[PDB]
């Protein structure tokens, strides 16, 4: 297969896998914890205590607004985009995918900037976040693919003549 067809397969698996990541992990900061079983509640508690995540446990107002945007705007677009790139040749996904890419990239620039430069001392984060530079890379590692893959998607829909 081609690099174009392979990238469409990758984008489909990215949009297909983003549905359980959002419903079962990300939305635990904006949706009540009662709706989640003790297994998933404690699984997110593992990531927060091991990766030293400051945002997921007690989301600030700016991070909660992005999680609601992920619920109302991104989650419905995931199955639509998954079908579009799994099937192939869906010219109608260009503008919707560009809007998703710029939106998602804009949400993670402040996320990556906070993890890399903000103060997580016993600050309004109250020592929840990372202290060392190595612990910050462990956190940026989980968040960075959700900026690069939309970046690839933005460049892919702007120039590909098969979607114009």
Ligand X SMILES: CC(C)CCC[C@@H](C)[C@H]1CC[C@H]2[C@@H]3CC=C4C[C@@H](O)CC[C@]4(C)[C@H]3CC[C@]12C
Ligand Y SMILES: CCCCCCCC/C=C\CCCCCCCC(=O)OC[C@H](O)CO
Residue numbering of the annotated binding site? 72, 74
Cα–Cα distances in angstroms (integers) from residue 3 to residues 6, 7, 9, 156, 162, in the given order: 5, 6, 10, 12, 14
Q: Which is nearer to ligand X, 65 or 121 (CB)?
A: 65
Task: Report residue 132 as tokens.
Answer: 């060392």
Dihedral sign, Cα of residue 24, residue 27, residue 29, residue 31: negative
Contact string 19-58 vs ligand Y (x = CB under 6 A)? ----------------------------------------
Interface positions, 87-146, toward ligand X (CB under 6 A): 104, 107-108, 142-143, 146
Partner interacting with residue 56 (select from ligand Y, a second copy, ligand X, none; CB below 5-8 Å by kind): ligand X
Q: Quote the DSSP letter at residue 93.
A: G
Interface positions, 50-89, toward a second copy (CB under 8 A): 60-66, 69
């Amino acid at each position: 297969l081609g690099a174009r067809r392979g990238l469409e397969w990758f984008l489909g698996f990215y949009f297909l896998s983003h549905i359980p990541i959002t419903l079962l992990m990300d939305l635990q900061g904006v949706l009540p914890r009662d709706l989640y079983p003790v297994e998933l509640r404690n699984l997110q508690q593992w990531y927060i205590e091991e990766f030293k995540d400051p945002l997921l446990q007690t989301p600030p107002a700016w991070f909660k607004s992005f999680l609601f945007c992920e619920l109302v705007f991104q989650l419905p677009f995931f199955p639509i985009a998954a079908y579009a790139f799994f099937k192939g040749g869906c010219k109608w996904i260009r503008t919707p995918a560009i809007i998703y890419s710029v939106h998602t990239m804009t949400t993670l620039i402040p996320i990556l900037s906070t993890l890399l430069l903000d103060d997580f001392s016993k600050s309004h984060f109250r020592g929840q976040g990372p202290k060392t530079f190595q612990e910050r890379l462990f956190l940026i590692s989980v968040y960075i693919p959700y900026f690069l893959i939309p970046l690839i998607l933005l460049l892919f829909m702007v120039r590909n003549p098969y979607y114009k």
